[PDB]
């Protein structure tokens, strides 16, 4: 049975995804290096139970809704904005992704980036390439003994810190919440302190309304003269022209930016920033999280998630679905996804009692529009298959399945 | 203290402030401080009456200039290189030269870490493309440093510090050296360079400039490096065959390089730079700034002020680059020194002068090179006797210079 | 908050204060704190109107005591062990029991380091020699721990932590586990237990108790051990064949050992302890104090208080050692819980009611052990509807306890 | 190089032998233990180099009849078992190993504080008697605790690093300002250190500044319920006061490895008022007694004898003027002599006359004696006549041509 369950993988996900699939028993895998055109996409997805895609493939309403057999969708990536998360929820297909798999990559990028900035290496290299030699030591520093101020002490600030400390930098941080320090990191309660003390400032924050432009003319002029600004969290967090200002003012020595409010949609599309005129700014194409090793983690994680769901019904971490997860105990497990009618649960429970079946466990979780419930029962294939078909006749029923 | 005040220290070229702090602490307070270089003209003027000089790599102390200063005792290269100073001519006049050969250790190790971090990410190519309107975001062939193998070639002061910083970052560290060296942390000596080249994700060079290292990284070797690997050189301009490096990068056998030193380099920051490596967005080129930081300058300042101060106080030429190295521990009595050409009978005039004043020599350190000879002598005696002996010493044929240091 | 004042916490055997700060930090204030153990008249007396109780290892909660505790909602064993508690008995009554399985971690790793350092150094013997008046200065046989190899048998909470500290000190760290573990730091998993016994200078046991571990370190395993090596068992009393170790100690195949646990241990600090290990000055014997520290007692106070708090506030039996495990995140509404013998028709009545009273179910999590079942039900509605429902819930034939939690 | 005889008595580490073998010196009379007076006299009577430990006594009488002997090697730190004077008179330098066990002392301290903070020594002593005493009250983890180090030199410095890798916070007191390593904080007043520390350890030298610097007062200023560890010197702690403070329970325990008076050997009785305290570790001065240190000493002191014989370095000799000369083309000769006028004048005259250029020379004196190394550019024959002539300067204790 498991090997009649087809995974469609596009955009060159990492091999380990494929390894995990196969070791879980899912050996039916149509895999693609690039993205597919419209007519091939619909061809390959017409009968896929699962799909793993990444940034570029668009699962629009129409695409999802022609996908006849689609059980869940796996964004092997961070973003899910290429998927109709809500079209998908109406057909009862959850969407998973990998939000915290890039951590070491971003941390590393930053460390690498600051080392070079503190030295004026970006600037020296740009001149070098056009035949201008600029050997000077004025302005330049080792990072050892410098103060690094991390704004955003989440999954990434944490690891950034640990590295910064590995290199003997002094580590201070600001987060709108009280965070337990690792090694000898130090929490600064006010942001204007952190800015003042810090030789380099790094942002590691979510894209919310506390963060839109959290760094303006104001905040930046608060920063130490000669300092460095690093942004590789979100494109909206920093007011580019402000920093452009502060960079010609030479109030800042330089900067690195891996994200922008606006980004080229493909790589053939042009890039535009005013920062593009500063040799002392590292400008990178949102590759903060782009490494093979990151790809391997996203591989392990989003396959892992698809498989768990397929095998156990778990929606822990699904982005568009009520979150359920029940531990394994002996018996059969079934599951019902449905509109939020009242008395679906009354309907469900009546079914098992009629058949004289004990419900070992169940977990119903509701969102505004939908409901998902996983029920364990002690019974045989015959019995479970009838409950199944009965469960499929409940009013509201979007989808239901015997998982084992 | 009133006798210190007489010794002109001239520091040009903007040496670190802690150099002056170190003079002052040692009593030497008369100092002509210049932030920049001086022309032919105000050189010879500020120097004329100058006991000690401090230059970096732009002041040119050539023969004529060295002949011009009527009172120069030592020279302090507050940098590594000494090629800007005619070593064989301060020697001729009995002026030892000093420098700071290893005051740049962290700075170079730090720089290499940053470079390899960004090169494994295809960041330099990304930044160049980005700054000209090209976006190119992809994950293929970009990698993290952690878990990667670093191949350090030349495991001396810098290799070693580089290695330490590298394993702190998660890298497995290997090295090759022509001598057998004791590893720190989990570094590993590799017996063949071809072994080390075949394995490394990154190879970084910290060897010295000499026949063995001249073009030691040539075609054959680059060819032995791992496909998709990285070449880094912040050692010497003559270690890597650059045309070869260029041909490897063009055929994508190497995926990047960072080079800080070149066969030939620009003499000032107004002199243009060229290299066949300029055509590559995936190569960091930096203008010999491996050891160019303020921490490094601070280190050089203390090192060399100390050497100059020590020479002045106790006559040590330990570490001097063009001069016989003598030093003797302070040890009760009066101390003299005597720099001479190796004339027959100099030593023999030296002890008769003391014999002939019934003066006991508690200590004597004599060292020579080709025609030069430096000897420092520690004596139990009066001052008038110490001053008298000095006069006698100064008249010995072959005597370049001699001084009663205390 | 006046609601809470009703709910009596009975703490015996003197648990750490941090337990009381959580308790009071959560509006929970009727606390009957005791430092010591209680006798039966003291216990029934002081438990009869207890809503919760925290005890330790000496308090014996039997069926006759439990079937007396009239208001007993849950039981916290402020400890690792639960053998002093009658789990089936409290399960029969719908009383979760909780504990702190992994709260002693650092306290055990810290002990083993101290011990291995002094053992390698032959300190226990020199100490006992000194106190008896004998001076034994030697260097034959003593070692620093840096660069020696630690074999950890059981690579879990304590093992992992043990290896981290050991690496801090420069030891080489190897482990053998029955399952495949991700090694921390530079830790190395050894696949065959015999190579590990073969290479290791010190071997420290950190495994559970069970047939797979029982006497798992016997005469065979002891001889696989490196000459002049050291054994340390602070896991469980059944894992080492003490008389085998005693023989290997007598024969000097081993240099020493540290045993904190024993097949038979005194019931109280008043009962004598005997061991054929008592004869050997080069063995540390410790009265099962592996996890006995104040920091550990404070880990415990926090973990176990938090849990009893969480259960009283939100139903969570996540972690119970004798009860179905249920947990639901919070959001908008009110929340019921319901404990019942699993009887025909319970879930049917539950849902019949909700539709009698017109209540829409937001979330529901039911789990069961054998005849026992526990369901926690979030519903959206106002307090009259709620408590209308819960009164019907207690009427369902089978119900053991139902509470409108919030 | 085979004609040179080394006598190593008392089981110096095998790295000493491995090194002599490397440097091409193979004639070795090795002895696991100490020689009694006749054997010693017979093995040494032709030895060039003796390497001993702390039990051997090279007295004048033995040294003096020691015919072929050129340098002495204490594979140890003490040189009080060696008559340094008798040895100089005869121009025999004495080498030893000043600091070869810093880690060993730091380790002992870490293990001791960790157990002592757990009451493990008492607990263990009780368990050896039948008494079980399981308790958490008063037992403490090391991490998060204040360790106060008194004396921040080789060993203090090191100990604070370990302590830090354990999670302790490290404070220190030193009579001078020092650069703290890691998170170490220098503490300007002894009393302030004493009050704050959960565990105090000592690493000062033996001198008046140091005698009983920890007395009734200082102990009473230690935090109630803290620990004192001394592996420094026997003269640093007022022991009776410590006793008192363990008796009154102001201190929860101590560890003492050094004592005002120590048995001379393992066979002599050891006594002490602390012996009655199960919560006190007592150790027979083994803070440095480990194989790693014995090996470190092995390379070091073998290193120094090899160096003296190959090139004449007397750097670190404890009884001799220190002279050292880098090496250069030519021959090298050596003169040791009584410090008195014109030796150097006749030395130098010898080379003047045979018309031989002196490439360098280094002489250094004491009050009573003088040593000088000479690099000359000449064939072997001329160096020989020179030797013979230098051997004759009145004043000459000894002269040798090294290469
Ligand atoms: N450039 C790239 O390729 C990638 C960018 N990122 C971005 O990095 C950001 C953070 O990453 P994680 O560490 O995984 O997030 P996280 O959720 O684990 O941590 C973010 C932290 O910022 C804190 N925070 C939230 N609002 C704040 C406010 N505005 N002011 C100060 N602190 C605030 C939160 O407390 C949290 O600690 C996200 O935007 C993520 O998308 C992550 C991976 C790759
Ligand atoms: N670009 C820059 O800013 C600067 C460049 N440098 C250069 O870095 C180089 C290394 O500096 P340090 O580590 O301080 O020197 P170092 O002398 O301490 O280390 C050099 C090591 O290389 C080994 N070696 C010699 N020849 C070799 C060969 N043929 N193959 C392999 N190994 C060989 C030696 O045994 C020695 O261990 C020097 O050339 C120095 O001038 C140093 C500072 C700055
Ligand atoms: N002396 C004392 O006061 C204390 C003793 N302990 C005991 O120490 C032991 C370990 O504690 P934790 O680290 O929390 O346990 P843990 O469960 O986290 O670690 C046990 C590890 O050993 C492995 N293992 C199981 N059977 C094995 C076998 N036959 N051979 C090799 N490995 C095996 C398991 O797979 C697991 O990874 C437990 O027995 C615990 O009761 C715990 C606290 C204090
Ligand atoms: N029991 C044993 O096996 C051994 C004992 N020791 C003893 O340990 C002691 C320390 O050894 P090292 O670290 O090698 O010595 P060290 O010379 O490196 O350090 C001594 C430090 O103590 C300081 N000091 C001197 N007088 C002081 C005072 N009154 N108050 C505070 N600080 C003072 C000095 O500033 C110096 O920093 C020495 O006595 C040594 O003999 C050393 C090795 C082994």
Strand segments (E) across C180-222: 188-189, 202-205
Which candidate from B331, B352, B368 shows the least CB-CB separation from D359? B368
Q: Please choose, from the candidates A92, A50, A8, the residue with its C-alpha nearest in 3D space to the C-alpha of residue A310.
A: A50
Overall residue count recorded for chain D in this entry: 403
Q: Please choose, from the candidates A142, A158, A139, the residue with its C-alpha nearest in 3D space to the C-alpha of residue A150.
A: A158
Please indicate, yes or no, whether residues C178 and C300 belong to a single structural domain of this protein.
no
Reply yes or no on whether A286 is catalytic. yes
C306 is in an annotated binding site: no
Please indicate, yes or no, whether residues B63 and B167 belong to a single structural domain of this protein.
no
Q: Is B264 exposed, middle or buried (0-12, 13-18, 19+ CB in 10 A)?
A: exposed
3-state secondary structure of C125: helix
Two structure tokens written together for A371: 């409901």
CA A324 to CA B123: how far, in whole Å?
41
3-state secondary structure of C20: helix
Please indicate, yes or no, whether residues C375 and C386 belong to a single structural domain of this protein.
yes
> Would the CB atoms of B364 and D361 count as touching at under 8 Å?
yes
Residue C147, Ramachandran bin (φ over 0: left; ψ between -120 and 50: alpha; else beta): left
Please indicate, yes or no, whether residues C100 and C118 belong to a single structural domain of this protein.
no
Please report residues of B whose CB lies closer than 8 A to that of D345: 351-352, 355
- Tally of structural domains, chain A: 3
Q: What is the DSSP letter of B275?
A: -
Two structure tokens written together for C266: 């005194």
Two structure tokens written together for D67: 């015919």
> Nearest-CA distance from A247 to chain B in Å?
16
CA A337 to CA A373: how far, in whole Å?
7
3-state secondary structure of A48: coil
Beta-bridged to residue D376, according to DSSP, are D331, D358
From the CB of residue A152, how many other CB atoms can be counted at a distance below 10 Å? 23
Resolution of the experimental model in angstroms, please? Answer: 2.6
- In D68-153, alpha helices (H): 84-89, 102-116, 120-129
Please report residues of C whose CB lies closer than 8 A to that of D135: 269, 287, 289, 292
3-state secondary structure of D112: helix
Please indicate, yes or no, whether residues A284 and A154 belong to a single structural domain of this protein.
yes
Atom of ligand 3 nearest to the CA of C179: 35
Return contacts of D208-214, CB within 8 angstroms, 24+ apart. Answer: D209/D175, D210/D235, D210/D236, D211/D235, D211/D236, D212/D236, D212/D237, D212/D238, D214/D238, D214/D241, D214/D242
3-state secondary structure of A60: coil
3-state secondary structure of D331: strand
State the best of C180, C324, C340, C347 to mutate against chain A, taking most chain A CBs within 10 Å: C347
Tell whether the torsion through CA atoms of A264, A267, A269 and A275 is positive or negative: positive
Considering only CA atoms, give the Rg of chain C: 26
From the CB of residue C58, how many other CB atoms can be counted at a distance below 10 Å? 13
Side by side, which strands form the sheet with C52-55?
C31-33, C9-11, C52-55, C74-77, C97-98
Two structure tokens written together for A255: 């900067």
Residue D352, Ramachandran bin (φ over 0: left; ψ between -120 and 50: alpha; else beta): alpha
CA D37 to CA A349: how far, in whole Å?
101
Cβ neighbours for C292, distance < 8 A, ≥ 6 positions apart: C107, D118, D134, D135, D136, D139
Cβ neighbours for D194, distance < 8 A, ≥ 6 positions apart: D148, D200, D218, D221, D222, D223
Whether residue C65 contacts residue C372, with contact meaning beta carbons closer than 8 Å, is answered with no
CA A110 to CA A152: how far, in whole Å?
13
Please report residues of B whose CB lies closer than 8 A to that of A259: none
CA C95 to CA D238: how far, in whole Å?
59
Whether residue C369 contacts residue A370, with contact meaning beta carbons closer than 8 Å, is answered with no
Cα–Cα distances in angstroms (integers) from residue A248 to residues A114, A219, A279, B384, D274, in the given order: 19, 17, 11, 67, 73
- In D312-368, alpha helices (H): 343-353
CA D116 to CA D280: how far, in whole Å?
8
Atom of ligand 1 nearest to the CA of A205: 22
Q: Please choose, from the candidates C318, C316, C373, the residue with its C-alpha nearest in 3D space to the C-alpha of residue C343.
A: C373
Whether residue C72 contacts residue C51, with contact meaning beta carbons closer than 8 Å, is answered with yes
∠ CA B141-B144-B148, nearest 5°, is: 95
Beta-bridged to residue C55, according to DSSP, are C77
Two structure tokens written together for B100: 């700071």
The single residue listed with the structure tokens 């439990």 is C66
Two structure tokens written together for C203: 């071997």
CA C14 to CA B406: how far, in whole Å?
76
Please indicate, yes or no, whether residues D279 and D185 belong to a single structural domain of this protein.
yes
State the best of D315, D328, D345 to mutate against chain B, taking most chain B CBs within 10 Å: D345
User: Domain ends where: D302, D319, D336?
Assistant: D319
Please indicate, yes or no, whether residues B231 and B281 belong to a single structural domain of this protein.
yes
Q: Which helix (H) or strand (E) holds B174?
A: strand B172-176
Q: Which helix (H) or strand (E) holds A389?
A: helix A381-391
CA D294 to CA C140: how far, in whole Å?
9
Q: Is C326 exposed, middle or buried (0-12, 13-18, 19+ CB in 10 A)?
A: buried
Residue C231 has φ and ψ, to the nearest 5°, of: -105, 145
User: What is the span of the domain harbouring residue B78?
Assistant: 1-104+294-322
For ligand 1, the distance from its centroid to the CA atom of residue A253, given in whole angstroms, is: 25
Two structure tokens written together for C154: 């059981």
Q: C-D interface: how many C-beta pairs under 8 angstroms?
A: 195
First CA to last CA distance, chain B: 13
CATH number at residue C185: 3.40.50.720
State the best of A315, A339, A345 to mutate against chain C, taking most chain C CBs within 10 Å: A345
> Nearest-CA distance from A366 to chain C in Å?
6
Two structure tokens written together for A216: 């303006």
Of these residues, A56, A91, A119, A286, which one is catalytic?
A286
CA B231 to CA D80: how far, in whole Å?
58
Please indicate, yes or no, whether residues D71 and D115 belong to a single structural domain of this protein.
no
Strand segments (E) across A219-341: 227-231, 252-257, 281-283, 332-339
Q: Please choose, from the candidates A223, A264, A262, the residue with its C-alpha nearest in 3D space to the C-alpha of residue A245.
A: A223
Please indicate, yes or no, whether residues C40 and C186 belong to a single structural domain of this protein.
no
CATH number at residue D338: 3.30.70.260
Residue B332, Ramachandran bin (φ over 0: left; ψ between -120 and 50: alpha; else beta): left
Strands D369-376 and A281-283: unpaired
CA B365 to CA D375: how far, in whole Å?
12
Q: DSSP assignment of C221-275, as one string?
A: HHHHS-TTEEEEE-S-TTSB-HHHHHHHHHHTSEEEEEE---SS--SSTTSB---
3-state secondary structure of A325: coil
Q: Decide: D118 in ligand 4 pocket, CB within 6 A.
A: no
Q: DSSP assignment of D116-131, as one string?
A: HTTTHHHHHHHHHHTB
What residue's CA is closest to ligand 3, atom 36?
C156
Beta-bridged to residue C204, according to DSSP, are C152, C232
CA D267 to CA B20: how far, in whole Å?
62
First CA to last CA distance, chain A: 11
CA D109 to CA A260: how far, in whole Å?
56
Residue B379 has φ and ψ, to the nearest 5°, of: -135, 145
Whether residue D399 contacts residue D335, with contact meaning beta carbons closer than 8 Å, is answered with yes
Whether residue B55 contacts residue B33, with contact meaning beta carbons closer than 8 Å, is answered with no
Of these residues, B51, B236, B334, B338, which one is catalytic?
B236
Overall residue count recorded for chain C in this entry: 406
Two structure tokens written together for C367: 């789990």
Side by side, which strands form the sheet with B31-33?
B31-33, B9-11, B52-55, B74-77, B97-98
Two structure tokens written together for D146: 């204040």
Q: Decide: C125 in ligand 3 pocket, CB within 6 A.
A: no
Of these residues, B21, B45, B63, B265, which one is catalytic?
B265
Q: Is D224 exposed, middle or buried (0-12, 13-18, 19+ CB in 10 A)?
A: exposed
Q: Half-sphere exposure (CA, 13 Å, Cβ side) for C89?
A: 17
Reply yes or no on whether B265 is catalytic. yes
Whether residue D237 contacts residue D150, with contact meaning beta carbons closer than 8 Å, is answered with no
Listed by the residue before each break, gaps in chain D with C–N over 2.5 Å are: none
Whether residue A28 contacts residue A6, with contact meaning beta carbons closer than 8 Å, is answered with yes
CA B254 to CA B226: how far, in whole Å?
8
Beta-bridged to residue B240, according to DSSP, are B217
For ligand 1, the distance from its centroid to the CA atom of residue A207, given in whole angstroms, is: 8
Two structure tokens written together for C198: 């073969």
> Would the CB atoms of C272 and D131 count as touching at under 8 Å?
yes
CA C285 to CA C128: how far, in whole Å?
13
Q: Half-sphere exposure (CA, 13 Å, Cβ side) for A261?
A: 11
Beta-bridged to residue A265, according to DSSP, are none
Beta-bridged to residue C336, according to DSSP, are C377, C404
First CA to last CA distance, chain D: 12
Two structure tokens written together for C379: 């519903």
CA A151 to CA A222: how far, in whole Å?
14
Which candidate from A342, A353, A364 shows the least CB-CB separation from C364? A364
- In A254-323, alpha helices (H): 292-312
3-state secondary structure chain D: CCCCCEEEECCCCHHHHHHHHHCCCCCEEEECCCCCHHHHHHHHCCCCEEEECCCCCECHHHHHHCCCCCEEEECCCCCCCECHHHHHHCCCCEECCCCCCHHHHHHHHHHHHHHHCCCHHHHHHHHHHCECCCCCCCCCCCCCCEEEEECCCHHHHHHHHHHHHCCCEEEEECCCCCCCCCCCEECCCHHHHHHHCCEEEECCCCCCCCCCCECHHHHHHCCCCEEEEECCCCCCECHHHHHHHHHCCCEEEEEECCCCCCCCCCCCECCCHHHHCCCEEECCCCCCCCHHHHHHHHHHHHHHHHHHHHHCCCCCCCCCCCCCCCCCCCEEEEEEEECCCCHHHHHHHHHHHCCCCEEEEEEEECCCEEEEEEEECCCHHHHHHHHHHHCCCCCEEEEEECC
Cα–Cα distances in angstroms (integers) from residue D41 to residues B67, D45, D48, D81, D85, in the given order: 66, 6, 13, 16, 19
CA C292 to CA B356: how far, in whole Å?
83
Please indicate, yes or no, whether residues D298 and D367 belong to a single structural domain of this protein.
no
Q: DSSP assignment of C375-400, as one string?
A: EEEEEE--HHHHHHHHHHHTTSTTEE
∠ CA B322-B323-B324, nearest 5°, is: 145
Two structure tokens written together for B202: 């990154």
Q: Please choose, from the candidates A238, A262, A232, A276, the residue with its C-alpha nearest in 3D space to the C-alpha of residue A112.
A: A232
Strand segments (E) across D266-342: 280-282, 331-338
Please report, to the nearest 10 degrees, the dihedral formed by the alpha carbons of residues D17, D20, D22, D24 taken in order. Answer: -140
CA B208 to CA B205: how far, in whole Å?
9
Whether residue C399 contacts residue C393, with contact meaning beta carbons closer than 8 Å, is answered with yes
Please indicate, yes or no, whether residues C78 and C195 belong to a single structural domain of this protein.
no
Q: Half-sphere exposure (CA, 13 Å, Cβ side) for B367?
A: 19
Strands D28-31 and D185-186: unpaired
3-state secondary structure of A197: helix
CA C75 to CA C320: how far, in whole Å?
10
Considering only CA atoms, give the Rg of chain B: 26
From the CB of residue D160, how many other CB atoms can be counted at a distance below 10 Å? 27
The angle, 0 to 180 degrees and rounded to 10, between the axes of the packed helices C346-357 and C383-393 is 150
CA A381 to CA C378: how far, in whole Å?
32
User: Domain ends where: C254, C273, C293?
Assistant: C293
Q: What is the DSSP letter of C134?
A: B
CA C343 to CA C368: how far, in whole Å?
12
CA A234 to CA A237: how far, in whole Å?
6
From the CB of residue B47, how many other CB atoms can be counted at a distance below 10 Å? 23
Listed by the residue before each break, gaps in chain B with C–N over 2.5 Å are: none
Whether residue C163 contacts residue C153, with contact meaning beta carbons closer than 8 Å, is answered with no
Please indicate, yes or no, whether residues D282 and D295 belong to a single structural domain of this protein.
no
The single residue listed with the structure tokens 């797979």 is C212
Overall residue count recorded for chain A in this entry: 404
Reply yes or no on whether C106 is catalytic. no
The single residue listed with the structure tokens 């030796």 is D343
> Could you tell me which chain B residue has the CA closest to the CA of A271?
B133
From the CB of residue B253, how many other CB atoms can be counted at a distance below 10 Å? 15
Q: Please choose, from the candidates B117, B118, B112, B136, the residue with its C-alpha nearest in 3D space to the C-alpha of residue B126.
A: B136
Two structure tokens written together for C81: 């062990």
């Amino acid at each position: 049975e498991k090997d009649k369950i087809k995974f469609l993988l596009v955009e060159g996900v990492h091999q380990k995804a494929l390894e995990s699939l196969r070791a879980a028993g899912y050996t039916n895998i149509e895999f693609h290096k690039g993205a597919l055109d419209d007519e091939q996409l619909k061809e390959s997805i017409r009968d896929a139970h699962f799909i793993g895609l990444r940034s570029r493939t668009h699962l629009t309403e129409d695409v999802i809704n022609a996908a006849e057999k689609l059980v869940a969708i796996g964004a092997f990536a961070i973003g899910t904005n290429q998927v109709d998360l809500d079209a998908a929820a109406k057909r009862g297909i959850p969407v998973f992704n990998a939000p915290f798999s890039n951590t070491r990559s971003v941390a590393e990028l930053v460390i690498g980036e600051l080392l070079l900035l503190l030295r004026g290496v970006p600037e020296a290299n740009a001149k070098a390439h056009r035949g201008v030699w600029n050997k000077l030591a004025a302005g330049s520093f080792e990072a050892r003994g410098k103060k690094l101020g991390i704004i955003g002490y989440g999954h990434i600030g944490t690891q950034l810190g640990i590295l910064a400390e590995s290199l003997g930098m002094y580590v201070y941080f600001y987060d709108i919440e009280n965070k337990l320090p690792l090694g000898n990191a130090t929490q600064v309660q006010h942001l204007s302190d952190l800015l003042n003390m810090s030789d380099v400032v790094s942002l590691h924050v979510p894209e919310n309304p506390s963060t839109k432009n959290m760094m303006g003319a104001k905040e930046i002029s608060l920063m130490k003269p000669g300092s460095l600004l690093i942004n590789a969290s979100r494109g909206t967090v920093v007011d580019i022209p402000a920093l452009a200002d502060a960079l010609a003012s030479k109030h800042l020595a330089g900067a690195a930016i891996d994200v922008f409010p606006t980004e080229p949609a493909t790589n053939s599309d042009p890039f535009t920033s005013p920062l593009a005129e500063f040799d002392n700014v590292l400008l990178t194409p949102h590759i903060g999280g782009s490494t093979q090793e990151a790809q391997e983690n996203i591989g392990l994680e989003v396959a892992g998630k698809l498989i768990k769901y397929s095998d156990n019904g778990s929606t822990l971490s699904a982005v568009n679905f009520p979150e359920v997860s029940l531990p394994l105990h002996v018996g059969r497990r079934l599951m019902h996804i449905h509109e939020n009618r009242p008395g679906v649960l009354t309907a469900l429970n009546k079914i098992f009692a009629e058949q004289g079946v004990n419900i070992a466990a169940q977990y119903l979780q509701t969102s505004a529009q939908m409901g998902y419930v996983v029920i364990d029962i002690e019974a045989d294939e015959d019995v479970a298959e009838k409950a199944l078909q009965a469960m499929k006749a409940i009013p509201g029923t979007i989808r239901a399945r015997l998982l084992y």
